[PDB]
């Protein structure tokens, strides 16, 4: 299924090295990805709940 979560991306620590990516660039970009994971999960939960309610109304 899904490999990561918003929490795992928040708490991920990368090791450092010479000529590594600037931390500010990477962390601001991953913060947008974190908001997306939250958006994705909320939409899925909304749809799974609608799916369940539609099913119940059919039977």
């Amino acid at each position: 299924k899904v490999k990561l979560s918003a929490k795992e991306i928040l708490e991920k620590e990368f090791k450092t090295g010479v000529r590594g990516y600037k931390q500010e660039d990477v962390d601001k970009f991953l913060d947008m990805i974190i908001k997306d994971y939250e958006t994705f999960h909320q939409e899925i939960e909304e749809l799974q709940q609608e799916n369940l309610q539609l099913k119940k109304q059919l039977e």
Partner: peptide, 11 residues
């Protein structure tokens, strides 16, 4: 911390 960037700044 609620964001990576806020943790990075504080550190």
């Amino acid at each position: 911390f609620n964001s990576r960037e806020a943790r990075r700044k504080a550190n």
